[PDB]
């Protein structure tokens, strides 16, 4: 049930699989949402060590359950390729300024 841990936030792989779907599909169109126009260019500059190519797009999993549709986007972001392939499940949570961490 937990596959992924955002602080407090628990998501299951059914979770991230929904979210990805619809920011992949945005992305696809070329459309965005929110006043941060999601889905964007993630340009990794935390580092983090993704085993899929990039370029990598970043876009909001709410914990409620819902799917992103411009609102506030909250603290965690599913990470996926051009190929549709899951890069990881990233959060501000616990992390300092405008950087990111690693969901577990
Ligand atoms: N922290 C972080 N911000 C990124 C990255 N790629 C793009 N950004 C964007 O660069 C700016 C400074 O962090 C923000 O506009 C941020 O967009 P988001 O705020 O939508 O994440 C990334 O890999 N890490």
């Given at each position: 049930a937990c596959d992924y841990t955002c602080g407090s936030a628990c998501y299951s792989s059914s979770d991230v699989s929904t979210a990805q779907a619809a920011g992949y599909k945005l992305h696809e169109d070329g459309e965005t949402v929110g006043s941060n126009s999601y889905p964007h260019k993630y340009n990794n500059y935390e580092g983090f060590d993704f085993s899929v190519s990039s370029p990598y797009y970043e876009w909001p999993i709410l914990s409620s359950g819902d799917v992103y549709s411009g609102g506030s986007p909250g603290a965690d972001r599913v990470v996926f390729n051009e190929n549709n392939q899951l890069a990881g499940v990233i959060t501000h949570?616990?992390?300092?300024?405008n950087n990111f961490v690693e969901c577990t």
């Open positions: 949570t616990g992390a300092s300024g």
